[PDB]
Design a protein around this ligand. Sequence first.
Ligand SMILES: Nc1ncnc2c1ncn2[C@@H]1O[C@H](COP(=O)(O)OP(=O)(O)O)[C@@H](O)[C@H]1O
Lengths: 174, 174, 367
Amino acid sequence: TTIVSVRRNGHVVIAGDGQATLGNTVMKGNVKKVRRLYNDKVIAGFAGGTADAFTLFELFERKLEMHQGHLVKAAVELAKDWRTDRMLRKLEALLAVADETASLIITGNGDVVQPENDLIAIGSGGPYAQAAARALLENTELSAREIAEKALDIAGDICIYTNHFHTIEELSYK
Amino acid sequence: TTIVSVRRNGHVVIAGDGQATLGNTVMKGNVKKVRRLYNDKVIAGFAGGTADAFTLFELFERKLEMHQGHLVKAAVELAKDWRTDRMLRKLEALLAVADETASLIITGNGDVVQPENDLIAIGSGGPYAQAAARALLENTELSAREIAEKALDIAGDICIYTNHFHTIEELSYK
Amino acid sequence: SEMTPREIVSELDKHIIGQDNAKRSVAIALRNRWRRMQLNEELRHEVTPKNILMIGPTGVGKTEIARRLAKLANAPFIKVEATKFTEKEVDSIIRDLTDAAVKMVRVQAIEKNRYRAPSAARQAFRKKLREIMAPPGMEEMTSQLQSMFQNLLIEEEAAKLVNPEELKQDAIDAVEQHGIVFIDQIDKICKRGPDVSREGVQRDLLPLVEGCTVSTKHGMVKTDHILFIASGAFQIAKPSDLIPELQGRLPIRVELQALTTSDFERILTEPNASITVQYKALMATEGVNIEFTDSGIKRIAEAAWQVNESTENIGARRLHTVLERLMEEISYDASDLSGQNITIDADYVSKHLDALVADEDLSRFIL
Ligand SMILES: Nc1ncnc2c1ncn2[C@@H]1O[C@H](COP(=O)(O)OP(=O)(O)O)[C@@H](O)[C@H]1O
């Protein structure tokens, strides 16, 4: 699994593969690991069980309603409830989320993190994509969509658990 | 255990073996892992404890009655309560179900999945059956029944946990 | 009333559309009432009402059958939610039924006293003429104490003509003989395997159907021959989940079918005082004349069916929310449109609704 997020020129994207591995076999190659949230104002991705994220994403939208859509404050409240609830603590996933404000990562340990250039790369192939995205972001004028696309394909060629099936959700704010 | 589902030419089937393994021994070779539901309009299979599936099947018919037999929406409500309820969370099984609309998989993680060609293959020998069914479906004009039958026999020759006792429930809609 | 079962169903067809099996079932129970009175002294005590259990999704007319039935027989009627007692005493069912029977026989007594309520100069003028604070449980008690303390021409004549001792004794006989009770959503008190509290409500309701006596300020009422009509979707639980003492007290069972798009088309027009007829008279009050095309009525029924299939199926109740959303512009301008004839064609229906029905996220709020 690999998920990338790039922000550039008033645009932010989230891209992820569709491979689902069971042991040494591929279970499904067209998984949709990226989706939109909070009435199309927020994009998000997840590395882990599909229903684990659907549970966390729904509660995250409820945290946004209590906080008027504030991304950071709602992300902490989600991370606080994630570690705290005996039922939510059983969940195992790596969340990635972004809006026009900023991009950040959410983990099951309750750690909320915003990478240096809002450059998120998670999953088994995350570190692969992160180095490809870092190279293009500094040495090219490519748009955030072009970087996340090419970086995800590179991670698919390298990671055995990542394929070339792609799903993207761009957000333009300019 | 291996269970296959194929859909072709207005027909959809579900086939499963009858082997029940206890450690390194065979406990029962004529297990009926396939049955019909919702007044003969739905076919389903299960890989796991027999009683765990009977419980999930009955509740699945309840969700179908609330949703007027809609397969997808009832599958989400079943996967919703499966992960949620402290009682149902203890159940461990892999459900497969299909109607004339579509075929899909249900898991104890709450994940609902529809395979690419509605081609389901679950159990310990699932990957072996998916390899054979994928070959025949693209290279032959064989009916869905002949594909699921031959694919399950090949999975039984390979998987030590799968035998050649078979149970099938076809649904014709044309 | 001496109406035969077919005469009962024929009258119910004037309001309820289809669901004939439920109409036939209630007609049998009401006909046994008249059949019991013709029996000898012994059999009248042994025979007990054939209580009915309606089964089906919400909004298919389970209540309207019970309402029109009690309105057809001029019988006292009450609807109760079985879940209300999961947290009031069950005996309140008979009390409120009598209070409704009292007001029923009382306003009916005024009707008998209403019409009761010469020189040439006599006819000429005749032509020109034409504090006590209590907790909520005893609030009704302190009412009676306050009315007792206060005690210690249409009004004076109707009070002079009425017989208050007769109206109170009659309402009891109207309840003991002709009474009807509707217990909605009885399926929700069945065991889900709360089961103690759910089945505990079933035990508390048991004496009311097994024949018991309930005290009331209006008098002592007996629940022996009262008819009861329970209802429930029974999608979660089944009637077999009811306690055995309760299953035997509901001899008649019936399943109401889900309404179709054609039924919605009929419900909008055919029933007497149908909702479409209601707004036609309402817009007539403003001097406006509305007319619905058969294609317009068709797409309205098609619109309500889509919302029930898209999100949640609420039965024929969806027709109410849709129709008011369609006529909202006319109902507001109806004052300024006096003297105009407005037509609700298929294009008018698609103009005000298709934009809404297309968005399921909005349909969960507006419709
Ligand atoms: N067969 C029918 N004929 C006419 N109107 C109906 C019919 N079924 C439902 N309706 C309308 O829909 C509503 C049904 O609500 P109700 O009968 O109280 O729900 P339930 O049937 O679930 O108890 C009523 O307001 C009634 O006007």
